[model samples]
Target: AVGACVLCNSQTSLRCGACIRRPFLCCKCCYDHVISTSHKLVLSVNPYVCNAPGCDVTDVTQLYLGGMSYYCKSHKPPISFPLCANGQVFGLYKVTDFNAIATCDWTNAGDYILANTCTERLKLFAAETLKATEETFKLSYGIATVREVLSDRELHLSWEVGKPRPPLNRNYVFTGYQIGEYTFEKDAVVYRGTTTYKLNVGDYFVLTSHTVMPLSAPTLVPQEHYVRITGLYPTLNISDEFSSNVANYQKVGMQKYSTLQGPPGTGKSHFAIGLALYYPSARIVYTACSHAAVDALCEKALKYLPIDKCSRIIPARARVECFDKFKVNSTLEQYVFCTVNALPETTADIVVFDEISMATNYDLSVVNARLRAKHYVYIGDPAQLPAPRTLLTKGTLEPEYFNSVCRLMKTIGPDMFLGTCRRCPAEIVDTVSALVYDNKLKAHKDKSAQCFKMFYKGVITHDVSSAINRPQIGVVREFLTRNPAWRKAVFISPYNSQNAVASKILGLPTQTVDSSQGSEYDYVIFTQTTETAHSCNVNRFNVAITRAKVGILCIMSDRDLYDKLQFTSLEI
Candidate 1:
């Protein structure tokens, strides 16, 4: 007669032997328990042996047979159990409730086998049939592994391989020793995990992921044009630090036609000197936007190059001598220095046009056609001021070539960029990078203490002729008195009218935004001159803010102007 199975609370027709002490169990459970034990079975209901593997007990509770497997109250199948076959043991467990049979390759059993619920038989079958496959892969190629299991539905792994992985909560497979699929709940993969991988050390385990596309190589301008010029010309072999400035100039100097473009504080003048030094035997014409700029270049060259091989060129009206021996002449001397208008007919090797952005197209063309040179090195920052419209219309220069940097970039495709900024403090360097270069530039850490502040006053409602904030001027003056080394500090303003007013108040020369293009100072004070929105030119603002090496202070007439400038400062 059928009775309730004690193990699973189900009805079964069979029962355990009299020696067994347990209550009646389903037939499947009863048989599974007996296979691993030394108990005997009985057809009658009186008393039965505990039909479990290796268990020798008398008067055990009766068990009933049920379903396909056997079970007893004293012994039930464990969630995870070890199966031993041919001296080797392997773990068998269900990853999901739906699958009851475990599958693996058994070494002794040839290749593959399905182990049953019967403990001893399953162990013997699995050990005989299962063998792990060996596969090796180089970690250098790239690999992504599960860093941690967030849940059954989610997991976190290493960084993305190609473009930043898109933020999508979706499903992916974990395919290996364990085959299962999981959902990514969010953009939950953390990038802080290990980026680099090692070889021949760690074991490869199963994970639910795959590698992406490889990263592309960086793009660089060709230096062959530069190489050709240097090979053809008899030049001075020069050596220096392999800084981006030096390397860029080496390429710029060799090009039959070339331009070097970068922001202020990025070694424009320094690179110009390096280029000039490379061709010491070649007669060079060095030009700049102003007499002061030309004079500064001369001072730097004197310290590094042969002074006898160079000459200072300025307008006769500027009261500057081209040479100690040679007077101002219409014809060019071996070392000639003259204004752009009176550029003497003299050039033999290379012409380095410094502050090239400020040169009129007419002036450049005149020099280009008049000067006898094998190569030209045009160096400037386009982010600064272009040639004055009045000069462009009045001179023989083409109005289209008023922006020399633009013209050069058009002809040569792109200028060789100088990467580092050696002139500004870390804070100011970062600020300029954010404002002009879209946070692509990097600045070295500042070892010295530096200050960067913006002081603002209320907006002016009346028709104030000059936007110079008078109260801020007194504060700036006090700062200069305390630190007199900053007396050379340059005050910059967007309007020429405001610059004159600020200059008069401080009794120090002030420069308009356009004139202050290629200059650096120990300190920089920017005086806001416009109230309209159009006054906030990003290029002009970039040049105005980057002129300071140690510190930068802005005295603004309107708080909104400061607010507008703040938009470009990004933390990256």
Candidate 2:
């Protein structure tokens, strides 16, 4: 160390030159300099931790000088200084829930410094300090004091005091109050009990029930719960068509799959309600691709379960709040009646994609990525007629993506098929099933010998009271207006050209064909336009004919198209 004499600049002069290290007489110049000068002092920042127990994490560690030093009191070894390299200094100090993060900011010289001055730090300190104070008072006195901290960090606190001394000083770092029956612990200084508080990064408090709360700062979007619904209802267990298919899905490694295919008039929605009621642990997301579908399902689910119960199935303690950014705790499942795109960002345990065929690959992929559950159950009849007017791929009536997905599933194994049609008349179901499935007992026509015994009465069929000729939109409207007495009607076009012609002629409202709006319509006009082979045409015919109430009306442009459809018997 070198020492400079302020009084004199001495070389070899006068009084012996003062030896800089220690004992020596100062020269006249040094003596004179010392008498004329004052000292400049610079103080360095220090980190501090409080000794109080049950204090917010703020009490854990704090920066002393301009808030640079962060000391963690709860952590062992007491003191540690983290060297921030590359001139990066700490950024703003953000506090939430139970933890706090001091974002680091750096200068070109690789030194850490606070972003702002004492004004900002003190301002934030005031709010946090006030909150701690209030919590302390509540825990000790059972006094509910209302305190509001302004955005600027100004604190306003008021209380009804039974006794008073010097009003509590606002500038102090710590303060305490007395409790009637509670006594301090062995340490005598640290207090332990229950209290409620809004958590901040360094803010912690015990609830009245003695539950300790802590907040964890997170950096990414939180995970949610998702549920998968595989089957609906069954008739005779093994004889039921969807059972094996559902079982196959489970065999295929789906751990979270469930089934509920209902026999006609079995109250499928009622069954769903019962499931939701009994198996409350299941996080179910109720959705239908269309408004009509959602409304229908929601209506049914609400019948047994109250709308409020259905709406607020998840309890309050489990409900995620807007302020919460980390994990979500939910009990009741999420119910939505919108298209696949409208599904909220949530962890679903069971996703009942009702009318699943209406969903596109894009929608399916998105839902799959966000889903937390293992089972994915798709509920819809691919054989049902496609929407009359679709904007997806020109005017094609086929549910392209749904068809592709089903084909993919079928390639792996046989798909579950619902054998009974509860919505249609028995005779209509019989005729349509025979025509569509080649009079076979299962979805596949070749596996059964029952086709040999079946009879087709042909053109003389009495259900022939069905509508004829393609009805224009205006013509159908007029017919309805004229015969407003009839409750239900469905249109049939055996070809896409006729369907398109009918759609244009009827001026039908446009509808989407994908998963979002797929299963929405109450009434439909079926038109099969593809000139594909017999199986495809028959498949198309089957789909179109089954999508109606009362009965179907055929409007074929070429009777020869129907004539060419033939079936040959094969021994099983």
Candidate 3:
């Protein structure tokens, strides 16, 4: 019985025994299969003519398939052929009608081979077929060149057709290409995000289709780089009143250079600390005009930063144990506390210059050149004091040139001025506010009853050795006895000689207006060492009165000085 042919299911007359089922096949199918491989074949004993179109092979054993035709091998069809080109070789696959395989030829014989073969027609057919396929595959469609064909069924293609809008919509689409999803979006552009494609910048791709819909633009992530370090510190907390200003300060601190200026008790240190803490990984160097100022800042930093993270640069003669009770050397490279003239060799991320009012241009210039930090922050009260004459000489360096606070104000400009004074009561804040700039600074009025007082006692005697007003001292002693907590108060005098005498009388460490620039007290006793108010600048008086948070007492040795103050004129 005859069996069905495997190729076309025609009645079979032969069998190619090598096949799985040993299926019988028609003469034409059997010859085609045997030509495609080296399989042996057997045919029926009945004689038959070749079944291929236009072929007549009487002997079944001699029948062969070539160019889709069955014929005797010697009487093969008149097939067009090209000789192999000489000298060099190249392979070109012809994928068009009447072509079953690729051909190769040298550059010299390629012209002749092209002339004889359907090379151009086949090229056009391939191009047309690809264009037809791309037209219907539209998720994102673009013409892209393959950058790389990677392992695991991956292809990297770059889109050269259009620009990337921050939120890329339906633009470029191609089969087998996936666009990466951004992990972060800032200013409309995605950054530092993960993606399926793992694409690099400038890589082009077209998403011909997507299973997932595009996501909507999300609200920008909070940039913790601008967040205050104090907020991150587990042990420290800032008041809500100052939170906004701290945020503003953090923004300013991100710049290359910035100045923070404010009146006394305006939380300059607090703001500076917050700014420094924002960049935890940054190597921050804090400096000031005096060792005392540096010491205070170091203490605050230690409280917020981990013990391993905080440190001070100390002088050779200074005691290391003074920085910490544990005696961890403060002079280490990581936590440095050197003088203004002496700076560390390593570069820092940020350098905070505190009390810039007292820093001379020479000192600032030297430190600025030495440290060369990525960012510099200048903090001080611009209204308080000028660079000391001893540091800034007239012929050598002008006071204005050496005055860093004024220089910064003139150059980069002040980024922020803290308006709120948290340390002082409203009454005293108002008095100092009017005395300095003639503008009323907002202060709490709840503690107005005991906030400010002025004594106009006549001087009984003034000794040249000790410039103490005897009656004023008696009143101060009585005030101290009445309010024992006021013992923590400090006496600020205009003259060093007077501070020495006040130190002996009050038995409290007395600080001059210059030395006590950043220091504060619960109560402040302003002793008028000079007989006339002309001897004091408004800045000096402003600093002294603003230091006291609870109360301020002004003692005048001369009646003229008292009269000039015009305390009654102030509308409390």
Candidate 4:
């Protein structure tokens, strides 16, 4: 009868359950006690040794497995046969040619289990063949290595050793890196509305790649950074209206239907100077409704582009030399910033019309009809009211020409309105806000607060005393001087009526409404004018109201007069 040991799958005379004289039986054992190959015993044998033929000595003592102790012999080697080369196989003898196993000549050599007999050798030979096959399969296929794992699926391996990194991500379908020059087909096509186009390294592109194929060579209109040329030249601000106006002017050039509006003393002339400074290449014609506006603009131009080095005003031509440093063009001609009554028959790159709302309808028509430039800028505040017209009858239709022209322009196109005011104290700002729009001032209102302390000592030694029928001017000035200590007081008159009064008591510079429009003073004394036309009085009041940057002392002959004055809507 035969018995089988289930643990090692070996034939043995071992039985667990007896079946009363059964011919064959099998043994079962607990999982932990099952027979298996001993890893420690196998590692104790030599894994490498000397291959010298007929050598009796073996350097088996050096054999080990991962720093663990292995049992082997320390043999004295002959001079001819040196100790086994480190990492060379050696050993104790057995060979099974058909099963591909071979035993070493010595026992326990080189940390490898060489069979003492041929049957065990056969088992080892079979294992070696199986292991080699498994190793080949692992190396040949399957993902491995950190580089392969980190690389994107669409990553195209094409980049120069040194260049600026492109704006891309893992999600991007790895199109090849751009080399020298590349142009998209959609760049030349025109677009409507405000659009953002990126021009990097001279390559233009729309940010998103989508299902609907975008146009190649798309005409890119950079609305965001458009340079507006208006007023005398355009005054740039971080406003959407400023950018939009610039873009529209660039697109059309001297074809205008809207006006750029700002009240008196709003840096209109200085802003125009800045524009002319920026665009020296473009020919600019600074036209104004009055010689005064033109002169103020010329003063700003001289300040910015000094006559000593950069510019000179030529009287005969009414043009300013903007190119003392260099020629205007290659033909050896110098650049010009000219003043004109109307748009000249010749074309200009930019034409800035200051106080456009003040121009008569006839003048406006002549200017508009003769405009030869591609861009035009009309800057004026309608709140100042149109220029006065004479010869009005109940039956006749001789209306105010300026207002009619403004209305016609308003009907033609929309305006890009500017709202931010940098001048005036918080209290005065609040009063203006309430008076103009029926709303409270949205800005902070601490007249003597810490932030305004820098302005208290004054920009220069100045006075606040002034003569007026109304007592509020003196009252407010004396109160501020004693309580908060404001210096550099300014006395503003309604249409120069209080000029004598301001000069007599204040002893400072007395400026008319026209002269005061673009200047800043520390404090303002607003003196109301005598009886005038209802519209004229309202216009004078608005002009006087905006003169102060620190604060204003508004003095009226009679507060009751304000009640009778009917205010009209001045659209922003």
Candidate 5:
């Protein structure tokens, strides 16, 4: 033999072709050794068991024919993705308390099994494994749905299928897995265990969790739309010092993808509106996870256009809804507003996704499959409370689901990132910015005092409300009585029960702190207990106090919430 054997240091021309570590071996040593059957004879190759325990795929043709370098497809390593980091270990998950919507109608909708899951984790966005393993991936694996998102709690997972025994209800860990980038482990194995699965893109696959691999693929305006127009430039109609709003909006023009991180009240929708006006030629479509976000964009755009152009900008379905907006379907409007779920099978020069922090992997994949955009922009505050993620959805526990989309925003330079708080009074902006934003945020009013006037009642005031583990309606009533002009107000509470107390007991418009998102009032009466405030979510608190444009009336046991409130600086 011409080459030396890996095992015995004897000469041979051939090496282990099927294993990951290809090594030359003597023809004599090949057939003789039996530690694990690599070769029955050194002169010629013989079949052996796979490296994964219990995966007895011994036929090399069966393994090698399907992209298995060393192990069978069921246990082979998955492919790395575009955003995969250096030396990051991919993850796998287990399904214990599991159930599914097993219907022939479901299977008929797209020749896929919808494995619905309800977990308390935001990152956990997928189906029960019982529906995944039936004749599905017993010997093979399921691919994450190429395109879908059912609801915040229920991940409507439609898995790829193959020959198998029908699945049953029981404990089933993800195996023959396709976790993809959604399978990230910033620390270690995120779930119960880890397993390998071969990626064979041909016939079928399964998505075991929200961490499902995208078969594919947020908003802010993009100038020339991240597609900078050659030899042409026009400032979109606005600015703040450092031109953060202008900088972010101008990016829409350059011919590249971009991200716009809009903190609370930084006018993300305003920039989106600015782009619609900036690019007279570029067609734009704006989408978000929620109907309200899209509707907000539609309403903001409505202020600029007349009825005839408004008809072309808003969807026909939205038009039928009084041009006020969705439950929207796909549209090809010059300035379009559609939910990401309603993204049309259409094209645009620029596409915007607002409130991207609420996006899950399921949301991203579904949108990418349908909409074709030359340049895409994602807008959201990573510090905001994430979209709800639980089957039995809870109020306080929803913040546990972190936004995976922010990883995409990491590529953005710090100077390009939006950090100016344009909508709040300076005192309130600095207080929370220091507490929650690591002192990076600056108030636009503090910068120039051009538009924002200091509210006469003062920017912030705190006092005792009640000792009964609830906000005192009398305290709010006394404050309102003292100031007759502060009539536009809302009471906010971390507890829904407290909101009910204010809604019915106080006879005022009240919203849970989580529900107060995308809303504003002349005054916000924030209620929190000493116990709940200390144990509160930092992002949740960020959402809580930022709802006011005028001032915050912190009604707690005392000013203790200002000291004890949880604070977390977001990555974005």
Candidate 6:
């Protein structure tokens, strides 16, 4: 489209690049004039095409910008962050490769995050391969990264190194994390909700890979050593009440695998901490089934013993410099706390397993081989709850080798019970004991009116017109309106949906009963929500009523009427 230069009125091939008219320019006069502004004066044989690599649009009038690549609507990359997930970290990534029937190799391993230019959507990459025996385990920054073969589908991660963007109101595709075997689309295009777009090329996002790790092989303890351990374990007797008093708790474990049946409020968790104080130089590994319970005990352990005397073994992904000295790379301390699932390759002189009823038979066997201690002390109530998952086989060893503490107590091993209740009032204690434990629990007897500011009546109820299991909107405000600093008070429910609705109105912390286990409050609102009586489980009911120390209020709906029919315990 050659034309006469507007400046010289002379015929020429050069034209203004960025201009819409594409006016031709003369050699010196017009070209020099065009240089005054930002338009490129170029001599072209044809119109310039769009700069984007998969695009084909071209304009005879528009000049291509130099040293730069751009996109048109047909193939433009996303202009914002990829998804609406609300994490402030990195861009999320998941590879499309399929990996199946593979374990991991842990040696020569290092965890890293890198730029993945493999495609436009995949901006970040990860590398971690480990060797482990597999039976479908996943981690949520708790255990080590999940394990699988290298060069396979292990890139599911959210990185935090990219450019910062406003967080989205949306949530992650998955809450915690599932097995690495999960697969997503190779090039998923949608971001956050259905209406949004994703990031374009050179768009910044973070990517993270998982840590691949496994426990050391189980080293079975010799049966001869197991049989050699024989001694009388502690019972909560007035003579040998296993009290924290100067003389009662510190004792020898003479039997091979002695058990302590700890009813609620009987100081089961405290026993492990007290044992270390009683036998300060003892080699003890306090193990449990979950991070929540195990890490909780560590808080008290660090209170009594310093870092040098104790080590808290956590999952690799949960690593942080926040607890530099307290977090142990190895179990070389006098006292240690760990989960049986993520145990290191070490044995202890005394291995204390809490919440034994919640443990799986397989994990029990694994711990059995790992720690053939001089004496074994197991503490937990058999009737509390079942584990997330476990084995049914009680065939490999004696019947005493069952994984559950509740069942193992009846086996050949000598086991005793702790019936004294130290937290709840006599009325609350009587109700819980009679309802659940067959009148096994007794109050500490020296009960004081400690936090009764919120503890008006031990059991009270308020019925509201609710949709589902919604809490009484005025529950927290009811007590808070009359008093100040009900910080020790909490509202607990069995359903997340109901909790979500109540979260808008409750002034204090709102929690599910499952999460509030092992924790206590002077006052609590057991938000029992249901269409009928059967909606509340007996286990959850028992947990809710006992958690209230001084008082408990039920933020209930009309459903409470039917629950009375479902449970005689509800009448209390």
Q: Which scores better on TM-score, 3 or 4?
A: 3
Residue-level lDDT for 453 in candidate 3: 48
* Model 2 per-residue lDDT at 219: 9
Identify the runs in model 6 with alpha carbons over 4 angstroms from their true place. Answer: 1-252, 319-327, 389-403, 410-414, 445-467, 474-488, 531-535, 556-572
RMSD to native for every prediction? 31.1, 27.4, 34.4, 37.7, 16.9, 23.9
Q: Is candidate 1 or candidate 4 better by lDDT?
A: 1
Candidate 4 overall lDDT versus native: 0.37
lDDT of 4 at 565: 25
> Which regions in candidate 5 have their CA more than 4 angstroms from the true location?
1-246, 305-330, 391-401, 410-415, 446-468, 481-487, 533-535, 557-560, 564-572
Q: Residue 59 of candidate 5: its Cα lDDT?
A: 46
Relative to the true structure, how large is the alpha-carbon lDDT of every model?
0.48, 0.33, 0.51, 0.37, 0.48, 0.47
After the best TM-score superposition of candidate 3, give how far the Cα of residue 200 lies from its true spot, in angstroms: 77
Worst 10 residues of 4 by lDDT: 453-462
Top candidate on TM-score is 5
Model 2 per-residue lDDT tens digits across residues 14-117: 22111111111123332232222221011112212322455342321131112344433343234443222122112221022101111111111111111111
lDDT of 6: 0.47
Sliding window of 10 residues with minimal summed lDDT for model 6: 97-106
What tens-digit string does per-residue lDDT give for candidate 4 at 1-572?
Answer: 23332224344332222111111111222111112211111111232233334534222333322222222233323222211233222222101231122222111212122211223223223223222332332233222111111121211122233343222211111111221122110002111111222222222222222222111110111122224433224334424423423543443332333355554544466555544554545565666655556656656666665443222223332222232332222211222333334234555555667775555433443454444554555666655545432211122111122333344334443253334455665554544555542342233434422111111111111112222332433443454556453445666654432454445555646665555654677666554543334313444455565676665544444444343222211110
Candidate 2's displacement at residue 515, Å, is: 13
Off by over 4 Å in 4: 1-258, 264-280, 299-345, 365-371, 385-405, 408-414, 433-487, 495-497, 529-536, 558-572
Q: Candidate 2 vs. truth: CA RMSD?
A: 27.4
Encode model 3's per-residue lDDT on 1-572: one tens digit a residue. Answer: 36655445566646545432244556555555544444443444332335556765554346444454345556556661211112111111111221221111112223222222333223222222222323333433354444654432244444556643212211121322334322221112222212345544354434333222111111111122433332222213545644656556555545566677767767776776665555555567778867667777777666555667566665554322345521334444444544574566556766788887776444455465567566667777656766443211122222123353454454555677777777777766766666664463556544534443444444634333334465666667777787687787788766655665567778977877766677777777777756643235566666766777666667765554344442432111
What lDDT does model 1 reach?
A: 0.48
lDDT measured at residue 68 in model 1 versus the true structure, 0 to 100: 27
Q: Per-residue CA lDDT of candidate 5, range 1-572, in tens?
A: 24554444455554444322234444443333222343221212333335566776654323322233245556656651211112211111101211122112122312121221222221122221122223233344445332333222122234456633212111223432333222211111122223223333232223243222322232112234333453224555433432445555565556455667677887777777777565556677778887678767778877763323432233333312223432333354466777765566888777777887777545655665677777677777767766543222123332223333454453332224567777776766776687666777777754212111111111122222322233355566666677665556787866554554466555678777766888877677776634443225677777777787766666544333455432221110
